[PDB]
Amino acid sequence: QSIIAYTMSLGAENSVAYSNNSIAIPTNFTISVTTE
Amino acid sequence: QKLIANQFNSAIGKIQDSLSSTPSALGKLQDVVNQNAQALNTLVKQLSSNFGAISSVLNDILSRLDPPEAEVQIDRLITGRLQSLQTYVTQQLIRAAEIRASANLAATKMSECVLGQSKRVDFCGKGYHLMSFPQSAPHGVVFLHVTYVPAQEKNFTTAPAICHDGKAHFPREGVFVSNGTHWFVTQRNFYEPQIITTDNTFVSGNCDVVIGIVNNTVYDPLQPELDSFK
Amino acid sequence: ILPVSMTKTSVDCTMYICGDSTECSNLLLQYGSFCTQLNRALTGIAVEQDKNTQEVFAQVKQIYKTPPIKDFGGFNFSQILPDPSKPSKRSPIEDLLFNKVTLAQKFNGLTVLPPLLTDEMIAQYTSALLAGTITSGWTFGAGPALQIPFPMQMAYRFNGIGVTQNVLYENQKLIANQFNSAIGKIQDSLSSTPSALGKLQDVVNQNAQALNTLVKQLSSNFGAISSVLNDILSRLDPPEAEVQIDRLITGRLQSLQTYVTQQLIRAAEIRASANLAATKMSECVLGQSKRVDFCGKGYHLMSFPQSAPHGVVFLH
Numbered sequence: 001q002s003i004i005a006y007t008m009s010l011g012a013e014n015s016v017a018y019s020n021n022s023i024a025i026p027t028n029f030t031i032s033v034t035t036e
Numbered sequence: 037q038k039l040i041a042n043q044f045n046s047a048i049g050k051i052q053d054s055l056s057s058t059p060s061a062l063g064k065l066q067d068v069v070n071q072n073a074q075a076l077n078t079l080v081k082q083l084s085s086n087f088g089a090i091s092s093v094l095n096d097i098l099s100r101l102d103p104p105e106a107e108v109q110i111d112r113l114i115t116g117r118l119q120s121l122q123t124y125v126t127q128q129l130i131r132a133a134e135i136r137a138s139a140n141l142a143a144t145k146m147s148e149c150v151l152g153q154s155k156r157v158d159f160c161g162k163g164y165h166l167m168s169f170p171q172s173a174p175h176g177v178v179f180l181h182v183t184y185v186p187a188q189e190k191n192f193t194t195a196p197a198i199c200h201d202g203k204a205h206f207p208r209e210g211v212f213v214s215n216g217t218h219w220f221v222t223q224r225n226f227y228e229p230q231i232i233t234t235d236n237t238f239v240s241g242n243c244d245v246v247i248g249i250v251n252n253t254v255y256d257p258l259q260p261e262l263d264s265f266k
Numbered sequence: 267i268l269p270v271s272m273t274k275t276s277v278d279c280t281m282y283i284c285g286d287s288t289e290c291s292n293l294l295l296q297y298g299s300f301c302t303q304l305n306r307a308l309t310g311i312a313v314e315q316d317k318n319t320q321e322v323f324a325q326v327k328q329i330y331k332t333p334p335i336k337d338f339g340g341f342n343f344s345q346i347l348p349d350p351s352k353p354s355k356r357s358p359i360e361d362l363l364f365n366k367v368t369l370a371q372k373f374n375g376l377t378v379l380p381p382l383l384t385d386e387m388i389a390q391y392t393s394a395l396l397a398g399t400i401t402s403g404w405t406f407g408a409g410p411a412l413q414i415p416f417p418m419q420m421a422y423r424f425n426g427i428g429v430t431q432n433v434l435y436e437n438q439k440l441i442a443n444q445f446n447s448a449i450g451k452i453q454d455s456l457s458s459t460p461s462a463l464g465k466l467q468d469v470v471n472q473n474a475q476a477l478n479t480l481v482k483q484l485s486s487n488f489g490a491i492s493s494v495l496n497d498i499l500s501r502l503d504p505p506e507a508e509v510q511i512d513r514l515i516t517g518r519l520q521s522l523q524t525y526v527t528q529q530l531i532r533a534a535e536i537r538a539s540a541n542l543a544a545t546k547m548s549e550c551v552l553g554q555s556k557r558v559d560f561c562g563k564g565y566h567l568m569s570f571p572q573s574a575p576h577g578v579v580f581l582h
């Protein structure tokens with residue numbers, strides 16, 4: 001329980017499994033509602 | 037249809053809870069009110085300053101001082117108050133110029149997202165736009181953007197073209213995929229595979245120029261009708 | 267080339283006007299609260315500048331990377347991806363842009379606040395955007411990132427402008443060579459023109475000239491007998507020196523107000539381009555644009571973002 005000072009993290013990190021004869025196609029969907 | 041209706045109902049149920057439970061959701065609408073109130077209060081409070089005169093209120097200045105020695109103090113006070121009014125007017129002009137630019141965007145969004153369907157990405161929501169609904173606010177407008185987000189993806193192997201009888205076949209409005217041995221045609225935004233047929237593919241050229249072409253068979257609808265007719 | 271933000275400055279009334287003088291500070295207190303609102307306006311401008319850069323670059327919550335082995339069907343992409351050889355992890359075009367535009371003092375209660383996003387973070391954001399749009403198409407701007415081979419994505423983008431798929435596949439090598447040649451010529455075109463990047467140096471020079479003019483006003487009599495408070499106080503009776511002091515106070519206050527007003531106008535005009543760079547990023551970079559003459563001149567295929575000292579560069 002204190003106050004800390006760190007360096008910012010830009011976000012989550014991942015790598016896409018890129019290949020020259022591979023494709024990914026979704027099999028479902030979701031309906032979302034936003035506010036503005 | 038039933039699943040989509042249930043998802044829409046649940047999503048429109050969640051929004052009231054999100055607005056109520058989470059505070060400071062309408063900070064944008066409240067900042068302008070706070071700024072206007074602060075500017076007006078600063079303008080009113082600037083009437084208690086003397087700007088070097090012996091007093092702020094004019095009554096005592098005119099009372100305890102002779103007119104020849106009062107035409108200087110009154111002039112100084114007038115100069116101070118005019119300079120205090122000018123800045124308020126200018127800041128109001130700048131804020132109005134900002135609000136006009138913020139309202140032109142609202143008019144554009146209403147016209148191009150409520151009365152139609154938007155094709156420009158990230159203009160109305162995060163995802164593929166379907167529809168939106170407007171709601172009023174104390175000094176603004178609230179849009180509820182309904183979007184389409186894909187999920188539950190799986191990976192296949194693909195080919196750009198299919199070689200058959202020395203001809204290259206390209207899909208019309210889909211892609212060629214494979215579940216390990218067979219080949220199908222599916223739409224790009226959703227997995228609905230169909231058998232490869234000369235109906236959903238077109239022929240252009242041969243199998244030498246294209247690189248990455250594979251081998252398979254293309255079904256012909258005329259095969260069984262010939263055998264059916266004796 | 268589009269500028270997205272300018273420098274942040276903070277100005278202190280007491281140090282600028284009075285100069286640690288008790289008589290001036292006591293005399294200045296009768297004017298009300300001009301300086302509180304001046305500081306409030308400057309702080310608002312600074313916070314707006316901090317917000318401007320976040321809405322342009324920070325549009326991806328995830329940091330993608332390109333695969334270690336690069337075979338994109340014959341397309342090069344070496345001139346835009348970050349270079350591991352360079353210690354700053356910047357593309358050659360970004361290095362040229364940073365070298366082409368180059369920029370200090372601190373006196374009289376004038377300070378400059380550092381930006382929140384360091385240039386390394388901006389470079390990382392643009393690298394993530396490029397590595398996401400190369401190996402995943404436009405699908406990473408709507409939902410989860412889905413991979414697709416680059417020639418197939420280019421065939422997708424050819425269908426958008428009304429040209430069938432087979433045009434690309436039977437002309438793949440020619441298109442790759444043309445793209446590589448254009449990418450190569452971009453560097454020479456940018457480096458050999460001394461006024462290509464004049465949309466940002468204009469902003470830098472304008473801010474510098476404004477700050478220089480503000481300080482130069484400290485050496486004006488405004489009707490007093492001297493421009494130095496100590497010389498006025500020593501060579502006159504302080505009981506009867508209030509006229510000169512008040513004249514100097516009025517002049518310096520007017521100068522400060524003029525500077526603040528012009529800064530507000532300049533920030534209002536900078537935000538109108540910071541709001542256009544974000545729109546261009548969203549529409550040209552994360553998708554494909556059917557609007558005419560929005561992203562380039564011709565039929566749009568794709569765009570690549572590159573960072574700049576205080577802006578952003580799009581390769582359409």
Ligand SMILES: *[C@@H]1O[C@H](CO)[C@@H](O[C@@H]2O[C@H](CO)[C@@H](O)[C@H](O)[C@H]2NC(C)=O)[C@H](O)[C@H]1NC(C)=O
Binds near residue numbers: 218
């Ligand atoms: C991919 O899907 C095809 C299409 O169903 C599968 O092929 C079927 O396999 C079953 C099991 O042996 C047979 O009874 C069916 O007659 C086959 N159908 C067809 C179209 O021939 C296939 O097994 C699936 N898996 C792979 C790896 O291809």
Ligand SMILES: *[C@@H]1O[C@H](CO)[C@@H](O)[C@H](O)[C@H]1NC(C)=O
Binds near residue numbers: 029188
């Ligand atoms: C898709 O999502 C719905 C959500 O209720 C679920 O019921 C269904 O089983 C899912 N099916 C697939 C294809 O993943």
Ligand SMILES: *[C@@H]1O[C@H](CO)[C@@H](O)[C@H](O)[C@H]1NC(C)=O
Binds near residue numbers: 192
């Ligand atoms: C999906 O990726 C996995 C990775 O291990 C691979 O084994 C599998 O075959 C892929 N699915 C396909 C290509 O149908």
Ligand SMILES: *[C@@H]1O[C@H](CO)[C@@H](O)[C@H](O)[C@H]1NC(C)=O
Binds near residue numbers: 020021247248
């Ligand atoms: C993909 O790369 C492998 C490895 O070099 C190669 O054998 C294969 O032919 C390539 N497939 C395509 C897309 O032509």
Ligand SMILES: *[C@@H]1O[C@H](CO)[C@@H](O)[C@H](O)[C@H]1NC(C)=O
Binds near residue numbers: 202250
């Ligand atoms: C595929 O079909 C072509 C055309 O008949 C044939 O020449 C070739 O040997 C077959 N095998 C391959 C390369 O898949």
Ligand SMILES: *[C@@H]1O[C@H](CO)[C@@H](O)[C@H](O)[C@H]1NC(C)=O
Binds near residue numbers: 336341342343344
């Ligand atoms: C890109 O072009 C350079 C030119 O020197 C070449 O060396 C390199 O192999 C090419 N491929 C990539 C992706 O770097």
